[PDB]
């Protein structure tokens, strides 16, 4: 599959927003919850990568964040998480460089003004004792770095929509 171009699938987000008519508490509450899930998950993934390196856990973690991101229309984040699941199941053996991924953005102008590598993190990984699982681990770290960037972009757009930094 090709990563979606748009940061937010409004068809989905509008649907959620249409269910929070009484008080905007429903949809914005979901978003806030998501933001927090995302930061918690990125941190847990990072920990696995630098330690236990359990691919099943990384798969579960990708599955978890894909649920909330997709249900809220943050389709680029959800796409990356599905790559992390497939990487974790050793079903894939490649993950697009960051530049190629940013080039698919429908509005490229959302990127200038920011360093896209600002949140990147290296993976503490045994390069010598590189067993056949190293590739999956390195590929999931690459995708985690992409995810941190997509999360960043999603917060930019969600923040301009709600007129308030989230």
């Amino acid at each position: 599959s090709t990563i979606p171009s748009e940061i937010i699938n409004w068809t989905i987000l509008n649907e959620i927003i249409s269910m929070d008519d009484d008080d905007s508490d429903f949809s914005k509450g979901l978003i806030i919850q998501f933001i927090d899930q995302a930061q918690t998950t990125f941190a847990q993934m990072q920990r696995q990568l630098d330690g236990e390196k359990n691919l099943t856990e990384l798969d579960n973690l990708g599955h978890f964040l894909k649920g909330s991101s997709a249900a809220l229309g943050l389709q680029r984040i959800a796409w990356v998480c599905e790559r992390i699941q497939n990487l974790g199941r050793k079903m894939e053996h490649f993950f697009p460089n960051k530049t190629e991924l940013v080039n698919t953005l429908s509005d490229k102008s959302i990127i200038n003004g920011i360093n896209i590598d600002e949140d990147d993190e290296e993976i503490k990984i045994q390069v010598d004792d590189k067993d056949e699982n190293s590739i999956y681990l390195i590929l999931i770290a690459k995708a985690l770095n992409q995810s941190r960037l997509e999360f960043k972009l999603a917060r930019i757009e969600l923040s301009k929509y709600y007129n308030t930094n989230l």
Binding site: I12, L30, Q37, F64, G67, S68, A71
Partner: protein, 124 residues
């Protein structure tokens, strides 16, 4: 009196489907976060009376996933009511595996309100 169990590992998804169900007119919704937890909520109502009219269950979940969960509920308990699999992997291959595992229907994620409605009509 319709009673439904939603089994998903993410609270956000639980809140969304529960809201879509409330808007369809269903108020008695129960939640579980994994397969084991769902098995217990079900083993329990198999001791009372008011059992679930339907179960919506994530195919993938930690501890006990959806397929193993379904298997236990079907075998160990004698639950014969509808179980709907929730997953984003919706190839024909994926869907058949869910049915082969004892799940009656499927909804793709992110679940869409009309699809939910369509599922309620045929299984509820």
């Amino acid at each position: 009196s319709v009673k439904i169990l939603v089994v998903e590992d993410n609270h956000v998804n639980q809140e969304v489907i529960k809201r879509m169900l409330n808007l369809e007119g269903i108020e008695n919704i129960e939640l579980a976060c994994d397969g084991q937890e769902a098995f217990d909520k079900v083993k329990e109502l198999t001791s009372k009376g008011e059992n679930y009219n339907m179960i919506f269950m994530d195919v993938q979940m930690p501890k006990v996933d959806g397929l193993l969960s379904t298997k236990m509920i079907r075998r160990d308990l004698g639950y014969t009511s509808p179980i709907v699999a929730l997953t984003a992997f919706a190839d024909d291959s994926n869907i058949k595996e869910c049915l082969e595992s004892g799940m009656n229907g499927f909804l793709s994620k992110p679940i869409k309100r009309p699809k939910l409605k369509t599922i309620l009509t045929e299984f509820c």
